Amino acid sequence: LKNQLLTLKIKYPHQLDQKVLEKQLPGSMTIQKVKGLLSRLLKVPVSDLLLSYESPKKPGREIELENDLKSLQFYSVENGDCLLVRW
Amino acid sequence: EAFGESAETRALLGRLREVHGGGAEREVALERFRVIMDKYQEQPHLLDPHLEWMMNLLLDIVQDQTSPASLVHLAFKFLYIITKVRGYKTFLRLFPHEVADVEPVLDLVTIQNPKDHEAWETRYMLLLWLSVTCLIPFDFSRLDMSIMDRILQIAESYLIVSDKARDAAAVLVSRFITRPDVKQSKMAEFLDWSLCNLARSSFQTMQGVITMDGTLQALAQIFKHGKREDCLPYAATVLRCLDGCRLPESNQTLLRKLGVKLVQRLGLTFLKPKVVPEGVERVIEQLLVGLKDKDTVVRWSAAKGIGRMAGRLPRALADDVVGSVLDCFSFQETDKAWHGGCLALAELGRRGLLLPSRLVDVVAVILKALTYDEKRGACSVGTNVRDAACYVCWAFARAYEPQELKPFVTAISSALVIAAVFDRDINCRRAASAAFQENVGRQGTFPHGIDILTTADYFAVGNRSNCFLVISVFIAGFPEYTQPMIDHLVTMKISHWDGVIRELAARALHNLAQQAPEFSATQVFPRLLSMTLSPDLHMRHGSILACAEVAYALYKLAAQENRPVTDHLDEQAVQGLKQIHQQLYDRQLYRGLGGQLMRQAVCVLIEKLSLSKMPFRGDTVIDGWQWLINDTLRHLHLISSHSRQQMKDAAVSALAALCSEYYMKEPGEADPAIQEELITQYLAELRNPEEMTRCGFSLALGALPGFLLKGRLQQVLTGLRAVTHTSPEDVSFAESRRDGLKAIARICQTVGVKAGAPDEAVCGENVSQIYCALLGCMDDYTTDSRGDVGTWVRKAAMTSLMDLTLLLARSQPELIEAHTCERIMCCVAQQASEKIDRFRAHAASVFLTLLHFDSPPIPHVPHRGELEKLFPRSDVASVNWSAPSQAFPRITQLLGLPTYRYHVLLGLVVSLGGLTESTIRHSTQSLFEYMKGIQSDPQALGSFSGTLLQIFEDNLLNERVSVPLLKTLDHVLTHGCFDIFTTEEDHPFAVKLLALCKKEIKNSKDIQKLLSGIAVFCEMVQFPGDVRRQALLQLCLLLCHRFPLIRKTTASQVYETLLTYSDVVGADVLDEVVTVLSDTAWDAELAVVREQRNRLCDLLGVPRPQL
Amino acid sequence: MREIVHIQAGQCGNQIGAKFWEVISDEHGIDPTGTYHGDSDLQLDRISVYYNEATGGKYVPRAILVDLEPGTMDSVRSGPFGQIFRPDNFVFGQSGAGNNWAKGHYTEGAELVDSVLDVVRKEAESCDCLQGFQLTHSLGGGTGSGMGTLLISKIREEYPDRIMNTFSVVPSPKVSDTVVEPYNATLSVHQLVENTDETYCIDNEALYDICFRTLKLTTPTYGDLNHLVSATMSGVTTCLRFPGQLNADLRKLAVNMVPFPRLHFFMPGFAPLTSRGSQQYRALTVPELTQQVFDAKNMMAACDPRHGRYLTVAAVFRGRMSMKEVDEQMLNVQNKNSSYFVEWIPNNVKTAVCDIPPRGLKMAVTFIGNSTAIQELFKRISEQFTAMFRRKAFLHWYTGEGMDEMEFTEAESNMNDLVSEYQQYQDATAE
């Protein structure tokens, strides 16, 4: 599982005062699980959480994760990317 | 109307100087420009007002000497796109044509590389521009290698280019060699250059054919745009060189087309343009054969040449040409020869060359061309010779005069309207309509020429179905287009190869007989009575359909004057209707592929005969018809599945019409001899092992009238209910059970309602037993090898419960009980919330029809006010129930009611945990929207959890509802719905849920069921207390399963849960658990995985399991 | 010697066919002039399946290109390989169908349909024994949408004993903003069900998402999608152009992969995913390829193969992998006890192994399965077809040419029945 894990950094563009986090999540994880994780961490409703993933290979770009039944591997979420959460 | 993208166009070109280096931006602009330009490909004349500035923004870029080659190529691409959109002929009149624009263009073209395929758009357009600069009225010597020599070399080098540039070299040399100073300098040189290329090159290589095509195009353009007296001396050498090449024998279409185009031009040069060397005698010899070519492009090009040559030659040769062209219509030719001859005749008549002497001949051929359809295999050919006949007829309006056409107008006008209605191709109909309009506008001597155009205009000969039942009657209304129009349909369409043409023709004759009953009963019916003896299979079906339709029409006509049907049809014709069955039974035509067609035709014939009250009652013909119907309803599996429903719905209708017409003794009664045998045989046929036998006999028994059910209704109902019951032998018998319910519903709708008569109609004595059979088939959920076939058995089980509930509502609504009505409502609600889309739509439609029914209102409607407010009348036709998005948001609201909670939730669980993706995605969103409103109220959440646990307990050890429910529970727990129950230790709800899950995951083998169980066991760790520890133990039991995939999935789920909920494990031991779940291969041998499992158990406080 | 006639119609169809022909020519070792210069005898034992042996040892293609608009015709005529296609195999008009299905199938595309039959019949007369026709077009438009259906309906009447295979390219709102696309797609699918034995669906939304995420391209143009389409086409037609133990012809493949008549839409794919320009970066193995062939990301359609049953499965491997190494890998993934076992890789799968690898890659793989998830491609168009049908928007254009609501409701009922049958078969017992 060590090779399958990916270290993602959670950003907060709407709340720049917050610090940039860093969590090692499994590659075979659905965006439905990450939504609940963020809801339980930041105490924000699940439905009121728009996710997105920005690769360091594509600066100036943002992909929206609207589908919840898909995993992070399908969205080309490689190691070292950043996840921008909004609400 | 006008160009509206110009506001965006001037900005695009403004960015041409910036997106010239980048590739992505250039491609986006080019694609964008192309999608902006292709919208006006039908309206090319709308861009002319913008052809001024739009060009100035392009040619001005290449003119600048301080620009790169990429920008020049990008601008030439847009220039070529604009030329393609509008047209080079109308676009090159805008290109610079000064004497100071020639040397610029020449050097520009000479700076190009023919090998660069990417810049092909620059070489194809540049050449064209040069042609413009060749239009100046100045001499090339005044400009001064010379310019003429350079232009000639460029043309010679481009005329053999395999790219599109070759075409650009055709219009160029056509204007450079045809000049005064250059037709006495370069013409002879380019002439010895073309002859050598034509004599050396062959049509066996790709480069030899390219050069030949280029040379032929150049010569054809030169002889076209060149002086007649200048290109006359060199008219024999080129012709001889072309004849010595043997182009007709070559296997190239473009080469032959160019050869014909050059031969016709050479022939036009010999004759003087007025309002004949021996060489001409050969030219014609090379054109006539062109009409008998294999390709249509060759004939279309030869027709123009022949038409242009007949007008520059005398009247003796002009008549000889027509006489020779008429020979193509002999009895030893194909359809291509006829097409070529028609094209040549049209081209000749368009110019006014045909004399009235050839009227008796030409008119004697066109009549054969408008109805050409010579079967050439499975399908027939002739649509080409028919489109040409339309153009030929269109030319008579300009050639002959009214005085010369009057003798043949009576036949031309009729043929035009006959071919402009019943034609199979819309193009032929439109061409015939245009020809008729042109003839009426010019000649104006056609019977009712104006009245026929107003009803059959260009926007009226579109729908083929409308032309057979609207325009046909309007044309037959007059006495000039009735008998021939009927004879055409009788001797052409009703004997056609396609079956749609033998059905449409019959339906058209049905209406045509109303305006001409005498002619259809004394002249047409005898011809359809003899056509049935035709060995042709398509001929017998058409004749039977016509005999049925005309008979029905005559019966309907006689019904007006309350007159008998024998008034129009004589007894001789009547004897044919009786012997038609004997003729088919003797020859044994009910076999092979045509047997089904013959049976279907005879069924419709018998139905139309019984619906007309014929004098056939008490004859052997009725017995023969009954035997045939029984044999058809006896042998159904032998018929193909692509036409079984038609035979099933037609035979039952014919039997009902016969059993509701001939099989009667007195009003309100029937012949007991037939009643004691038909019902007995049917009840002995409803127990047939073959499923198709019952599928056909149930509907036949149910379609019987009401007077034929008096006294024998209980037996029929019992026999139909015996089939609806499932047994060990009848497991996959869904089609039979469907027909069993359909026949019961039909019987209920026919008999109606009548108190004090259980054997005659439905009443309160047997309504309960009938409702019990309808409510029992809804629970059928068979899963055969084909799939979920039980759905079918449910479809007919829904409509049967609708039409019935309304029947009582229109007579004795008090019979409908409250419990039965509530059960039906709950079952319909459950059936209107299924993952399926086609079935859910019908379920919702039935529910809305049953709820909105208020005439009178139906009793026992649970929560009638809430249901009406949640499903208003406006949300019936506007809402699409087939789409989950436009259905689940409105169906999830039903959970608020108490009655609509258990069944609705059970039905929605299948959609919230099925296989389809979009349905689940929509159902989850619709359920979360409703849960958000009952999330704070603890009573609502408790009731929902109780109902879910009850549904779980009901469907235990069931792989139809257990897996969907377990999958939906995972999402329900991940979303955070049961958040109030987490603030209490030892929650009975979470205890019973875990207990039921342990039951459902007991020895679970399949991996699909194990995944949902593992997910639920990991999403249940949120509940503190004894449910947290015990649940954890289960995870351990899954970390050392019998498969490595299960262990890996369990480890991944445990790792995810450890990151989700942080209060489950202390921070002091979380590091060890995280490090043990990372560097551990859970897909290895169990000998090493057991140690890791024990280590994790010792850390998580879980007691050590025991084998 | 079984020959196949390839036909191309519409702008997108011609652009896909040109790229596919260029790819299969560069893989076979054929210079753009016409001669042969490869370095392998296996590139000639089956060249007659798609190339006629003309005089001088030249190989003439068999691509019949037709297009009402004179746009893509000139581009393909002056392309890198434009000099290969016979010059009288190009059939075109001037004005197209104006994004109307009732124009390129009744009033306009039926004006060149006769010249198309003459050309396709003149091309087949030289063949010794024809196997089946082929067509490459896009459901979006009128000359691709109506012309393809008209030709399929006209050829089946004269050659009922020939296989009919197509490569429909379902459009998507992301690639095109045209609003008259749902009707053209519905009317095309209505005819592609009753007169077609096999249809390879290549959704445009899938390729768009792949180029947006996987390739990380800035503005995915038509070239990026055409490259992937041609790669998938070349990977699918590997057994019909190279030797091998699995000598599955066209008819045999259609009979073994299409048990039902109406159900015949596949979900073609290909791996590894690459783009234009560079390509050599990482060398994949057989395990990695097998793990990636069956991923929904490597599929060229917006469908999840895992979510839905598996009618028929098939895979084609290209490179120095052996059918013995492949069988070992295909017999351990259909077993649960086996490690790294997958639940979406089904059993009784068809498998192939090729020698000649693709261009720019040493090892690759192609997937040609038929899963019920393809129903999602039919429902997405159904909704867009209903919301616009209730208001009768843009219906006058169709009613004026000759069409009527009868054909519309017939196509709607056919699509609904197909979706219902797919959903019913999705829930079937495995054993």
Ligand SMILES: Nc1nc2c(ncn2[C@@H]2O[C@H](COP(=O)(O)OP(=O)(O)OP(=O)(O)O)[C@@H](O)[C@H]2O)c(=O)[nH]1
């Ligand atoms: N993948 C891909 N899709 C294309 C391409 N060209 C067009 N399309 C799509 O196909 C549809 C347009 O159909 P076209 O092929 O351009 O049209 P046509 O068949 O020539 O028909 P007309 O518009 O009537 O002339 C839209 O959905 C486009 O996005 C292409 O090269 N590749």
Ligand SMILES: [Mg+2]
């Ligand atoms: Mg086009």
